[PDB]
Amino acid sequence: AIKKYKPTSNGRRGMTTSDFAEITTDKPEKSLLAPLHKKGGRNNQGKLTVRHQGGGHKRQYRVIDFKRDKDGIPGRVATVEYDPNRSANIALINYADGEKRYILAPKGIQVGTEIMSGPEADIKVGNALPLINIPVGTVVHNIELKPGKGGQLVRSAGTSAQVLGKEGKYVLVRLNSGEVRMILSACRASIGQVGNEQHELINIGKAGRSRWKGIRPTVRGSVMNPNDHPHGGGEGRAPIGRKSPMSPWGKPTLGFKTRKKKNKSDKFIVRR
Amino acid sequence: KDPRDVLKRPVITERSADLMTEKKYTFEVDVRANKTEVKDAVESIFGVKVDKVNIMNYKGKSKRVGRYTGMTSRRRKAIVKLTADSKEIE
Amino acid sequence: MKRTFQPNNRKRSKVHGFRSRMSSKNGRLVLARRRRKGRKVLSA
RNA sequence: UCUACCCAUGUCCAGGGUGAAGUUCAGGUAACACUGAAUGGAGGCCCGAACCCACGCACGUUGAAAAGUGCGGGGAUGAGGU
RNA sequence: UGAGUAGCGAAAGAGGGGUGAGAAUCCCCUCCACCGAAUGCCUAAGGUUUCCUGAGGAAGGCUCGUCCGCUCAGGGUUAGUCGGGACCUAAGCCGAGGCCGAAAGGCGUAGGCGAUGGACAACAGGUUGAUAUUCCUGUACCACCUCCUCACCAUUUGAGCAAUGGGGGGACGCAGGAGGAUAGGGUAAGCGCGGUAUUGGAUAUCCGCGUCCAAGCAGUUAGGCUGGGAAAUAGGCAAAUCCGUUUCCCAAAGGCUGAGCUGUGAUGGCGAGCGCGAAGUUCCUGAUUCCACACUGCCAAGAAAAGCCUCUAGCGAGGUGAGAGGUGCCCGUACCGCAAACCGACACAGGUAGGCGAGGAGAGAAUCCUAAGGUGAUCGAGAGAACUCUCGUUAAGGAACUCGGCAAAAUGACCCCGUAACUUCGGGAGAAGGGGUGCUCUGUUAGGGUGCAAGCCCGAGAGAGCCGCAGUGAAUAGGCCCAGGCGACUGUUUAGCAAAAACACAGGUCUCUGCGAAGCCGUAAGGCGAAGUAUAGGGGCUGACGCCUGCCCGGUG
């Protein structure tokens, strides 16, 4: 699923890209595009709050249904499309009643297969169930915290979650990175592995490709000046003589946990 | 408003004398007056029929005398093309 | 050798025009003190 | 209104080379590789105008000019210039 | 004071006439010269009368000045179709309600503003001193209205009308390559007009000039784009004939769009040339333009909305269509705009967005000289010293000079031949480095394009000869090689002393964060992150690739 360019120029020396055999078409469907202008890392008052961002190729948003609301209608899918929003490629599925909708394409999905969405759906890849009907030990994705909100938790390419068990009002599912969490039983997740698994195997060769992607370059703090960063200054190349390394805003940035220790959510994380 | 005020004074140049031969007439009109009420004014008060009206306005020329640097009046000049076999004007 | 002043009437009246100064409170103080001073061209 | 960066929307890049990946054909093998022709046209590709930049030298230094000119230079389909 | 000194701001004029009180500087004429992908022609931003005419020369003009971008007195800009408004919306801005905040205020919904975008109907001739798709001329087109005209429908089993509601559209990137057409170009042929010269020669395959016409209307077309029909209907907040979706049947028809081209517009205009006015065709070449973002491929995956069409809800008793007659507002319109009117304090060797942008040779907008066209650029003449600067040559030696081949010199085009170590097999590599290039004839060469031909265009080569010291005879287009650091590379940076080994970079690694993520801005509402979800974000460090990355947790964190 990954092809490597033979090195003709010097930019393309280590230069692999993802071919699009999984992708079945090129034109996006008209009624579901959404306008989307890049903010360029600027706040509502215009100040820059996120570094290293802004200035990519222009993109058009595609509204995609994380909610999986419509229940019981047999949905067929005839496409697989590349979305230039998030790593995964997303698939338009068209319903029996005559309305078309967009879905994250899961692993091993193909054209023409059927999709069910109810709380009585059989568990096949791409289906949607509330967690109470999901059997234990099944790989699942697109989970949400609040019911009716729409899937939030596992959406990136090749990412997965397997249900460790139900125990009542709450269900134990193991998210990605393994830090298991204890969540409502009434939320609707989508069955399977997300269908762009090989995405880490991309090798950006050119810096211009990341510039197309929309990544501004990142400067080290050690080559800063004294005022604008705690590391900067010192002639020659100096090691960071500031005990633990700290961020541009003074917070140390090497392994101290940063979450509000008095939050509400921490009574669900602590299974681990 | 009153039609007897909408056009102020005619202007007598060599160009104007040329156009009265071929039956177009020159007038200086009010600044707020536009292409049409000058037309309705002129057939209301002249008994003439006018085919086409052209309008253009001049801004004041800068002009110097003594040590003061004043500005002359902004003007709006109107051209009225009478129809065939329409009456003439003084 | 592009010099420090390129003229643009639209940007000039947008950033220094009378409506632009009256839109703010601080601009109103600017108008008031200029008028107390007695400037002929009172706003840009 | 200079300049740095960013947002939306336009515009510009005379010309000549190189020849990728695929595709077809010929062999090749049970098949798969593979081998050769044609095709194909990719490149933060090459050479080089407009355009942009400013590497060297000379002059200029009460200058044509409060930062330039002349002779050469670099990029020149891109992280492009405007 | 310097001192009558420096300077008088890139440039080829010269001569005769004329004005004048005064003439290198003003005007007229003849030659010469300069630019000509511009120093030509339009037109932005901007300036605001600098534009034209007639007077004047105190100041401005680096001199003069009879002169003008100066002064004075007049005069000059005409639009239903061009540009912008009464059309739409992006970024952004404002913002009733509201939400926050010691006060001022900040944020923001509905909504509105906001072109650099989308849509949107006139053109080619003439005209003066100044304007011209605006004025005159002829042919048009768009929107709207009805004192009128004819044709048709139904005036509730209703003709007609259609929405601030759905649906389609508008609706889109980049690169490359055919093809089709037209600009444009050659004067090749033919045609017309004028001429045949005095310097040796030339009524002759001789010389100079010209050899065209829209928009609209009717057809046609290179083409591109499209399957069509029927039934049913968990949808598109309400409806469905519209759209969407399944099932059944036919597969090419048909439809959409379409550069251009034919007639007409044209019994008219333009047209070399002395108010009049001839010929006004064919051939070849032929795009940087159009078909057209049409196709193909590519991945970084490529605006909104209203114009426009459709559907019902709805309105509905008079309308629809064609004539005939009428209506059609505001603002801009001069002049300059690579310049002496703009920005640089100046009539400043600088900068200044877009459209067109010819010929010879040429791959070309390079290069040199010219066309159309514009200009001789505002101090001069006259000696031809030192010295400074920009250039051109130098015998012999050739890098000795010099910190350093700095500078300068040398190679340079096209076609053949040939081309190494290393290599990440792409490269290195135009490696190096050789050889040929002019003209004439064999030849309107093989051969090819174009056309039925006639003719026109392109020209691989060889073979005989002719000259020059020299044949890409000028202008302009790599010096090269061998090693070694440093940095993988293209890139970026101290405007105005430092472009580098500095920064970035792809890659790597560590670390935080389970989504009202973390982090950041703000007190806060609000945001960014992100209309994203550990294959994702944030931070630190190192810097392609290859081989590796040892020991110490006593101290600090």
Numbering used by the authors:
A (entry chain Z): 2 to 273
B (entry chain s): 2 to 91
C (entry chain 2): 1 to 44
List sentences from the manuscript.
From an in vitro translation reaction of the MifM stalling construct in B. subtilis lysates, we purified disomes from a sucrose density gradient. We observe two major classes of collided disomes: one with only mRNA density in the interribosomal space and another with an additional density next to the mRNA (B and EV3). By local refinement of the experimental data and rigid body-fitting of a model of MutS2 generated in Alphafold2, we identified these extra densities as the SMR and KOW domains, respectively. On the stalled ribosome, the SMR domain interacts with uS11 and uS7, as does SmrB; on the collided ribosome, the SMR domain is positioned next to uS3. The two KOW domains bind to ribosome protein uS10 in a manner that is highly similar to the KOW domain of NusG, an E. coli protein involved in transcription-translation coupling. The KOW domain on the collided ribosome is connected to the SMR domain by partial density, consistent with a flexible loop joining them, arguing that these domains derive from the same MutS2 monomer. Here, only in disomes where both ribosomes adopt a non-rotated (or classical) conformation do we find density corresponding to the SMR domain, despite the presence of collided disomes in other states in our dataset.
In B. subtilis, the related protein MutS2 was recently implicated in ribosome rescue. Here we show that MutS2 is recruited to collisions by its SMR and KOW domains, and we reveal the interaction of these domains with collided ribosomes by cryo-EM. Using a combination of in vivo and in vitro approaches, we show that MutS2 uses its ABC ATPase activity to split ribosomes, targeting the nascent peptide for degradation through the ribosome quality control pathway.
